[PDB]
Amino acid sequence: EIPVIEPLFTKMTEDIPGATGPVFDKNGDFYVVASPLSEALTKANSPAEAYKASRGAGEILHIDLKTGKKTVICKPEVNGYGGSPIGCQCDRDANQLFVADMRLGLLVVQTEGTFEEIAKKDSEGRCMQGCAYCAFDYEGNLWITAPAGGVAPADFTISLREKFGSIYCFTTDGQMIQVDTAFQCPAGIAVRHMNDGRPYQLIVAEQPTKKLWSYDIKGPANIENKKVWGHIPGTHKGGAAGMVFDEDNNLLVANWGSSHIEVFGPDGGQPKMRIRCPFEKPANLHFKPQTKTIFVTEHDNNAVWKFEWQRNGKKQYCETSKF
């Protein structure tokens, strides 16, 4: 039996469809992503059906943590095609967000709301797929999951039932390298680092398959030894979505549809503990820097909550020093 804890959750905000991409920038400002397409995929009989019902482009919102006021930072669209941002990370050398988008690929978003679409195509020259989750390594290379088909203007599709989801690395030389493919809905992603700051394991959630995969990282866009690393419990619709490390390199994983966040030790395997949530659909999570406080987004109430974890979070790339 896996032991379960039931900490206190405090609701921070609501009325955010498909709430995801919780992120803190270098100033300690907190952002979340609204995703009409996420919410639609939850209710549809198909990706197409979901795409059709989706009210519009998603948005990056600033949330004031004292007042709860939501401010639209960016509503990305390119050429009439609405973006579907999901996952975010803050850069280290500039206060700007790198945003995985299921319709537009990888974005760089400024706090004043301008943005750049980073890649129409990958380095081999093939079209880009829609991106969902991303994680910086401490070198500045961005690892990205891509569960969707081609970016707009291709029809929207997602690898929820077929194997076509891919993994990329966007390197510090600005190359978008496809590093793996034929996933069934690759979702959350994380980089385990060595004591010395060196990147060395890539953890990737494959959502409906209730699996976490690992690879050994040997350099920028250079991975091998692909293995199943962790088991996600339950037979519910869903599976692992976002994930984050704590300071001890335990991996916390939102298990969408299970009402739990799963906690894996450094060697993976089975969860060592589960965290019971007051909602069925935790989607994504992020630590408040230099704190034990975890912010969690959820799709029962399209809300953001916080709870206290047993230790501080692992530093993100944005919190580390250039030298």
Side-chain angles (χ1 to χ4, degrees), residues 1-13 16-38 40-42 44-48 50-51 53-54 56-65 67-68 70-115 117-119 121-123 125 127-138 140-160 164-197 199-226 228-236 238-275 277-279 281-289 291-320 323:
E1 286 308 321
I2 307 168
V4 183
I5 64 159
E6 317 181 309
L8 174 64
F9 290 62
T10 297
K11 192 141 77 94
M12 299 306 283
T13 188
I16 303 169
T20 187
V23 67
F24 289 85
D25 69 6
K26 291 162 41 69
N27 302 315
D29 278 318
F30 178 62
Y31 305 81
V32 170
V33 176
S35 183
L37 185 55
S38 290
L41 292 156
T42 299
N45 278 293
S46 97
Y51 180 81
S54 169
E59 293 174 317
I60 309 161
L61 310 172
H62 173 274
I63 308 290
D64 188 300
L65 289 187
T67 76
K70 307 189 227 154
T71 298
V72 177
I73 288 308
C74 182
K75 188 171 181 102
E77 35 179 320
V78 181
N79 291 332
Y81 284 110
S84 175
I86 304 296
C88 306
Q89 282 282 276
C90 185
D91 198 3
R92 178 197 65 193
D93 296 341
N95 200 58
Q96 52 190 358
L97 296 178
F98 282 71
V99 179
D101 187 297
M102 296 250 271
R103 291 301 281 146
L104 304 171
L106 170 67
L107 315 176
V108 176
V109 176
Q110 306 302 315
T111 60
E112 58 270 22
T114 69
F115 72 97
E117 196 174 40
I118 290 328
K121 287 151 180 166
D122 70 62
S123 58
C127 172
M128 191 68 176
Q129 305 176 233
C131 287
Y133 296 85
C134 64
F136 276 121
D137 70 34
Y138 282 164
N141 301 288
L142 191 72
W143 305 86
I144 309 168
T145 57
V151 298
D155 298 356
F156 178 69
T157 325
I158 179 165
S159 50
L160 285 169
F164 60 85
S166 305
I167 313 306
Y168 301 96
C169 191
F170 181 57
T171 72
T172 66
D173 307 330
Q175 286 179 318
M176 182 66 77
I177 299 157
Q178 199 191 75
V179 297
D180 209 349
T181 199
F183 273 75
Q184 202 188 330
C185 204
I189 189 160
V191 176
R192 173 176 319 276
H193 294 87
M194 303 286 298
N195 207 51
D196 71 355
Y200 83 106
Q201 186 171 58
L202 190 66
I203 309 296
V204 178
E206 193 181 27
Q207 178 176 94
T209 72
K210 299 304 187 310
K211 287 159 196 187
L212 304 178
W213 293 86
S214 75
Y215 307 82
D216 304 329
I217 292 166
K218 302 304 198 198
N222 188 10
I223 57 170
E224 52 174 45
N225 194 17
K226 180 191 196 271
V228 169
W229 179 84
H231 168 71
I232 298 301
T235 63
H236 53 282
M243 59 180 50
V244 291
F245 280 108
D246 79 11
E247 54 179 352
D248 282 358
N249 306 300
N250 305 307
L251 190 61
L252 295 82
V253 183
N255 181 0
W256 192 102
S258 84
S259 318
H260 296 79
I261 296 167
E262 317 295 352
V263 185
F264 292 83
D267 276 311
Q270 309 302 314
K272 75 193 184 152
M273 164 171 282
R274 318 180 80 194
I275 304 163
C277 299
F279 35 82
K281 298 163 186 175
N284 210 340
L285 69 177
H286 210 90
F287 282 83
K288 183 181 210 294
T291 79
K292 301 198 192 322
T293 300
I294 297 176
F295 283 68
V296 186
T297 74
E298 61 92 351
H299 296 167
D300 298 34
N301 311 299
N302 289 345
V304 187
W305 311 67
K306 62 173 204 179
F307 78 92
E308 294 299 302
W309 175 232
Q310 290 172 353
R311 59 198 66 78
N312 273 18
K314 193 71 179 193
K315 294 193 180 137
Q316 303 280 4
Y317 172 61
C318 63
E319 297 172 68
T320 60
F323 307 118

PDB file of all heavy atoms in Angstrom, residues 10 41 45 66 74 102 130 138 155 203 206 211 213 236 288 291 295-296 298 303 311, unseen atoms left out:
ATOM      1  N   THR A  10      -5.347  25.555  -0.037  1.00  0.00           N
ATOM      2  CA  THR A  10      -5.954  26.865  -0.020  1.00  0.00           C
ATOM      3  C   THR A  10      -6.154  27.326  -1.461  1.00  0.00           C
ATOM      4  O   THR A  10      -5.220  27.311  -2.272  1.00  0.00           O
ATOM      5  CB  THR A  10      -5.043  27.826   0.737  1.00  0.00           C
ATOM      6  OG1 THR A  10      -4.927  27.381   2.075  1.00  0.00           O
ATOM      7  CG2 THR A  10      -5.607  29.229   0.726  1.00  0.00           C
ATOM      8  N   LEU A  41     -10.932  19.233 -24.748  1.00  0.00           N
ATOM      9  CA  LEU A  41     -10.505  17.819 -24.888  1.00  0.00           C
ATOM     10  C   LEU A  41     -11.051  16.944 -23.768  1.00  0.00           C
ATOM     11  O   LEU A  41     -11.280  15.754 -23.959  1.00  0.00           O
ATOM     12  CB  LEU A  41      -8.995  17.695 -24.915  1.00  0.00           C
ATOM     13  CG  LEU A  41      -8.356  18.283 -26.157  1.00  0.00           C
ATOM     14  CD1 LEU A  41      -6.909  18.649 -25.859  1.00  0.00           C
ATOM     15  CD2 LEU A  41      -8.435  17.319 -27.329  1.00  0.00           C
ATOM     16  N   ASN A  45     -15.552  13.895 -27.785  1.00  0.00           N
ATOM     17  CA  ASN A  45     -15.395  12.503 -28.234  1.00  0.00           C
ATOM     18  C   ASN A  45     -14.188  12.318 -29.151  1.00  0.00           C
ATOM     19  O   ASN A  45     -13.927  11.215 -29.616  1.00  0.00           O
ATOM     20  CB  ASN A  45     -16.665  12.016 -28.950  1.00  0.00           C
ATOM     21  CG  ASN A  45     -17.742  11.570 -27.985  1.00  0.00           C
ATOM     22  OD1 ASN A  45     -17.590  10.570 -27.286  1.00  0.00           O
ATOM     23  ND2 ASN A  45     -18.846  12.301 -27.952  1.00  0.00           N
ATOM     24  N   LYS A  66      -1.579  38.678  -3.702  1.00  0.00           N
ATOM     25  CA  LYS A  66      -2.168  39.385  -2.543  1.00  0.00           C
ATOM     26  C   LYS A  66      -3.608  39.637  -2.840  1.00  0.00           C
ATOM     27  O   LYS A  66      -4.492  39.424  -1.987  1.00  0.00           O
ATOM     28  CB  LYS A  66      -1.473  40.727  -2.316  1.00  0.00           C
ATOM     29  CG  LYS A  66      -1.176  41.129  -0.878  1.00  0.00           C
ATOM     30  CD  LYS A  66       0.336  41.249  -0.656  1.00  0.00           C
ATOM     31  N   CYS A  74      -0.686  37.893 -22.347  1.00  0.00           N
ATOM     32  CA  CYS A  74      -0.621  37.582 -23.751  1.00  0.00           C
ATOM     33  C   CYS A  74      -1.708  36.596 -24.179  1.00  0.00           C
ATOM     34  O   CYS A  74      -1.945  35.574 -23.517  1.00  0.00           O
ATOM     35  CB  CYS A  74       0.732  37.026 -24.064  1.00  0.00           C
ATOM     36  SG  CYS A  74       1.120  36.602 -25.784  1.00  0.00           S
ATOM     37  N   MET A 102       0.228  24.254 -28.179  1.00  0.00           N
ATOM     38  CA  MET A 102      -0.162  23.077 -28.932  1.00  0.00           C
ATOM     39  C   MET A 102      -0.514  23.412 -30.371  1.00  0.00           C
ATOM     40  O   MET A 102      -0.583  22.506 -31.209  1.00  0.00           O
ATOM     41  CB  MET A 102      -1.338  22.434 -28.269  1.00  0.00           C
ATOM     42  CG  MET A 102      -0.926  21.965 -26.914  1.00  0.00           C
ATOM     43  SD  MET A 102      -0.868  20.203 -26.906  1.00  0.00           S
ATOM     44  CE  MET A 102      -2.562  20.064 -26.449  1.00  0.00           C
ATOM     45  N   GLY A 130       2.772  20.613 -32.312  1.00  0.00           N
ATOM     46  CA  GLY A 130       2.230  21.344 -31.185  1.00  0.00           C
ATOM     47  C   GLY A 130       2.877  20.811 -29.919  1.00  0.00           C
ATOM     48  O   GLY A 130       3.053  19.596 -29.794  1.00  0.00           O
ATOM     49  N   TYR A 138      19.968  23.025 -16.594  1.00  0.00           N
ATOM     50  CA  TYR A 138      20.738  24.108 -15.989  1.00  0.00           C
ATOM     51  C   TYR A 138      21.742  24.743 -16.988  1.00  0.00           C
ATOM     52  O   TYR A 138      22.290  25.805 -16.722  1.00  0.00           O
ATOM     53  CB  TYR A 138      21.436  23.649 -14.720  1.00  0.00           C
ATOM     54  CG  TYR A 138      20.576  23.537 -13.491  1.00  0.00           C
ATOM     55  CD1 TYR A 138      21.036  22.823 -12.393  1.00  0.00           C
ATOM     56  CD2 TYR A 138      19.309  24.158 -13.396  1.00  0.00           C
ATOM     57  CE1 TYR A 138      20.303  22.727 -11.227  1.00  0.00           C
ATOM     58  CE2 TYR A 138      18.544  24.043 -12.246  1.00  0.00           C
ATOM     59  CZ  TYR A 138      19.039  23.330 -11.150  1.00  0.00           C
ATOM     60  OH  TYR A 138      18.321  23.238  -9.994  1.00  0.00           O
ATOM     61  N   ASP A 155      -4.737  20.771 -39.358  1.00  0.00           N
ATOM     62  CA  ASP A 155      -5.861  20.471 -38.486  1.00  0.00           C
ATOM     63  C   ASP A 155      -5.285  20.025 -37.147  1.00  0.00           C
ATOM     64  O   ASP A 155      -4.234  19.408 -37.087  1.00  0.00           O
ATOM     65  CB  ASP A 155      -6.751  19.325 -39.029  1.00  0.00           C
ATOM     66  CG  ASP A 155      -7.393  19.647 -40.362  1.00  0.00           C
ATOM     67  OD1 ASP A 155      -7.234  20.786 -40.852  1.00  0.00           O
ATOM     68  OD2 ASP A 155      -8.058  18.745 -40.922  1.00  0.00           O
ATOM     69  N   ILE A 203      13.096  12.954 -17.568  1.00  0.00           N
ATOM     70  CA  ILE A 203      11.879  12.235 -17.215  1.00  0.00           C
ATOM     71  C   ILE A 203      10.739  12.814 -18.030  1.00  0.00           C
ATOM     72  O   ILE A 203      10.554  14.030 -18.090  1.00  0.00           O
ATOM     73  CB  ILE A 203      11.545  12.340 -15.702  1.00  0.00           C
ATOM     74  CG1 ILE A 203      12.734  11.966 -14.850  1.00  0.00           C
ATOM     75  CG2 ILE A 203      10.326  11.490 -15.375  1.00  0.00           C
ATOM     76  CD1 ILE A 203      13.136  10.521 -15.026  1.00  0.00           C
ATOM     77  N   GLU A 206       4.180   9.805 -20.138  1.00  0.00           N
ATOM     78  CA  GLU A 206       3.370   9.394 -21.272  1.00  0.00           C
ATOM     79  C   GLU A 206       1.990   9.219 -20.708  1.00  0.00           C
ATOM     80  O   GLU A 206       1.753   8.292 -19.939  1.00  0.00           O
ATOM     81  CB  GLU A 206       3.920   8.072 -21.856  1.00  0.00           C
ATOM     82  CG  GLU A 206       3.304   7.789 -23.233  1.00  0.00           C
ATOM     83  CD  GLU A 206       3.768   6.479 -23.876  1.00  0.00           C
ATOM     84  OE1 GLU A 206       4.140   5.523 -23.159  1.00  0.00           O
ATOM     85  OE2 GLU A 206       3.763   6.428 -25.119  1.00  0.00           O
ATOM     86  N   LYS A 211       2.560   5.675 -17.638  1.00  0.00           N
ATOM     87  CA  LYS A 211       3.972   5.477 -17.500  1.00  0.00           C
ATOM     88  C   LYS A 211       4.794   6.788 -17.444  1.00  0.00           C
ATOM     89  O   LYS A 211       4.383   7.786 -18.040  1.00  0.00           O
ATOM     90  CB  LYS A 211       4.473   4.708 -18.710  1.00  0.00           C
ATOM     91  CG  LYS A 211       4.070   3.224 -18.731  1.00  0.00           C
ATOM     92  CD  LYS A 211       4.121   2.604 -20.137  1.00  0.00           C
ATOM     93  CE  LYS A 211       3.339   1.284 -20.148  1.00  0.00           C
ATOM     94  NZ  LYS A 211       3.477   0.559 -21.420  1.00  0.00           N
ATOM     95  N   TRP A 213       8.719   7.740 -18.475  1.00  0.00           N
ATOM     96  CA  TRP A 213       9.910   7.269 -19.156  1.00  0.00           C
ATOM     97  C   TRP A 213      11.127   8.017 -18.710  1.00  0.00           C
ATOM     98  O   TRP A 213      11.041   9.186 -18.353  1.00  0.00           O
ATOM     99  CB  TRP A 213       9.701   7.375 -20.663  1.00  0.00           C
ATOM    100  CG  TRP A 213       8.656   6.451 -21.218  1.00  0.00           C
ATOM    101  CD1 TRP A 213       7.307   6.664 -21.294  1.00  0.00           C
ATOM    102  CD2 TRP A 213       8.896   5.193 -21.868  1.00  0.00           C
ATOM    103  NE1 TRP A 213       6.685   5.585 -21.897  1.00  0.00           N
ATOM    104  CE2 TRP A 213       7.644   4.678 -22.269  1.00  0.00           C
ATOM    105  CE3 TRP A 213      10.053   4.462 -22.160  1.00  0.00           C
ATOM    106  CZ2 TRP A 213       7.513   3.439 -22.928  1.00  0.00           C
ATOM    107  CZ3 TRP A 213       9.913   3.222 -22.828  1.00  0.00           C
ATOM    108  CH2 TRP A 213       8.658   2.734 -23.175  1.00  0.00           C
ATOM    109  N   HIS A 236      -8.277   5.262 -14.401  1.00  0.00           N
ATOM    110  CA  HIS A 236      -9.017   6.452 -14.802  1.00  0.00           C
ATOM    111  C   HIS A 236      -8.547   6.989 -16.141  1.00  0.00           C
ATOM    112  O   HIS A 236      -7.429   6.748 -16.556  1.00  0.00           O
ATOM    113  CB  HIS A 236      -8.824   7.561 -13.762  1.00  0.00           C
ATOM    114  CG  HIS A 236      -7.381   7.841 -13.472  1.00  0.00           C
ATOM    115  ND1 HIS A 236      -6.622   7.033 -12.661  1.00  0.00           N
ATOM    116  CD2 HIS A 236      -6.537   8.798 -13.945  1.00  0.00           C
ATOM    117  CE1 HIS A 236      -5.377   7.470 -12.649  1.00  0.00           C
ATOM    118  NE2 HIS A 236      -5.305   8.549 -13.408  1.00  0.00           N
ATOM    119  N   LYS A 288       6.721  27.857  -5.344  1.00  0.00           N
ATOM    120  CA  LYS A 288       7.114  29.225  -5.071  1.00  0.00           C
ATOM    121  C   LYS A 288       8.580  29.189  -4.654  1.00  0.00           C
ATOM    122  O   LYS A 288       8.961  28.403  -3.787  1.00  0.00           O
ATOM    123  CB  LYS A 288       6.250  29.859  -4.041  1.00  0.00           C
ATOM    124  CG  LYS A 288       6.585  31.322  -3.763  1.00  0.00           C
ATOM    125  CD  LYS A 288       5.632  31.786  -2.667  1.00  0.00           C
ATOM    126  CE  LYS A 288       5.323  33.252  -2.775  1.00  0.00           C
ATOM    127  NZ  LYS A 288       6.542  34.049  -2.523  1.00  0.00           N
ATOM    128  N   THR A 291      10.747  28.251  -1.114  1.00  0.00           N
ATOM    129  CA  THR A 291       9.656  27.937  -0.200  1.00  0.00           C
ATOM    130  C   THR A 291       9.303  26.472  -0.398  1.00  0.00           C
ATOM    131  O   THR A 291       9.817  25.808  -1.303  1.00  0.00           O
ATOM    132  CB  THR A 291       8.339  28.795  -0.336  1.00  0.00           C
ATOM    133  OG1 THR A 291       7.532  28.339  -1.434  1.00  0.00           O
ATOM    134  CG2 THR A 291       8.614  30.273  -0.503  1.00  0.00           C
ATOM    135  N   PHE A 295       2.126  25.417  -5.883  1.00  0.00           N
ATOM    136  CA  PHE A 295       0.963  25.907  -6.538  1.00  0.00           C
ATOM    137  C   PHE A 295       0.532  24.850  -7.535  1.00  0.00           C
ATOM    138  O   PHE A 295       1.331  24.338  -8.288  1.00  0.00           O
ATOM    139  CB  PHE A 295       1.243  27.259  -7.235  1.00  0.00           C
ATOM    140  CG  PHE A 295       1.283  28.415  -6.277  1.00  0.00           C
ATOM    141  CD1 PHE A 295       2.289  28.517  -5.382  1.00  0.00           C
ATOM    142  CD2 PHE A 295       0.242  29.322  -6.216  1.00  0.00           C
ATOM    143  CE1 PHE A 295       2.355  29.569  -4.487  1.00  0.00           C
ATOM    144  CE2 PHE A 295       0.280  30.364  -5.305  1.00  0.00           C
ATOM    145  CZ  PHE A 295       1.332  30.474  -4.409  1.00  0.00           C
ATOM    146  N   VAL A 296      -0.764  24.531  -7.510  1.00  0.00           N
ATOM    147  CA  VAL A 296      -1.370  23.495  -8.316  1.00  0.00           C
ATOM    148  C   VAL A 296      -2.603  23.969  -9.041  1.00  0.00           C
ATOM    149  O   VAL A 296      -3.507  24.555  -8.438  1.00  0.00           O
ATOM    150  CB  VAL A 296      -1.901  22.311  -7.472  1.00  0.00           C
ATOM    151  CG1 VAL A 296      -2.406  21.165  -8.370  1.00  0.00           C
ATOM    152  CG2 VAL A 296      -0.836  21.816  -6.548  1.00  0.00           C
ATOM    153  N   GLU A 298      -5.932  22.957 -11.496  1.00  0.00           N
ATOM    154  CA  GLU A 298      -6.878  21.825 -11.540  1.00  0.00           C
ATOM    155  C   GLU A 298      -8.085  22.107 -12.359  1.00  0.00           C
ATOM    156  O   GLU A 298      -8.502  23.255 -12.485  1.00  0.00           O
ATOM    157  CB  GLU A 298      -7.232  21.280 -10.164  1.00  0.00           C
ATOM    158  CG  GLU A 298      -7.911  22.232  -9.198  1.00  0.00           C
ATOM    159  CD  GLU A 298      -9.441  22.203  -9.230  1.00  0.00           C
ATOM    160  OE1 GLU A 298     -10.043  21.547 -10.130  1.00  0.00           O
ATOM    161  OE2 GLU A 298      -9.987  22.948  -8.398  1.00  0.00           O
ATOM    162  N   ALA A 303      -9.230  26.065 -11.333  1.00  0.00           N
ATOM    163  CA  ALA A 303      -8.763  26.833 -10.236  1.00  0.00           C
ATOM    164  C   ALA A 303      -7.299  26.553  -9.964  1.00  0.00           C
ATOM    165  O   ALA A 303      -6.677  25.601 -10.518  1.00  0.00           O
ATOM    166  CB  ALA A 303      -9.615  26.532  -8.993  1.00  0.00           C
ATOM    167  N   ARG A 311       9.385  19.691   1.895  1.00  0.00           N
ATOM    168  CA  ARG A 311      10.567  20.519   1.748  1.00  0.00           C
ATOM    169  C   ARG A 311      10.523  21.494   0.626  1.00  0.00           C
ATOM    170  O   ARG A 311       9.573  21.522  -0.116  1.00  0.00           O
ATOM    171  CB  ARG A 311      11.772  19.643   1.566  1.00  0.00           C
ATOM    172  CG  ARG A 311      11.746  18.714   0.398  1.00  0.00           C
ATOM    173  CD  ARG A 311      12.793  17.647   0.662  1.00  0.00           C
ATOM    174  NE  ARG A 311      12.398  16.826   1.808  1.00  0.00           N
ATOM    175  CZ  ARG A 311      11.488  15.857   1.746  1.00  0.00           C
ATOM    176  NH1 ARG A 311      10.870  15.576   0.595  1.00  0.00           N
ATOM    177  NH2 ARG A 311      11.179  15.149   2.829  1.00  0.00           N
TER     178      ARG A 311
END
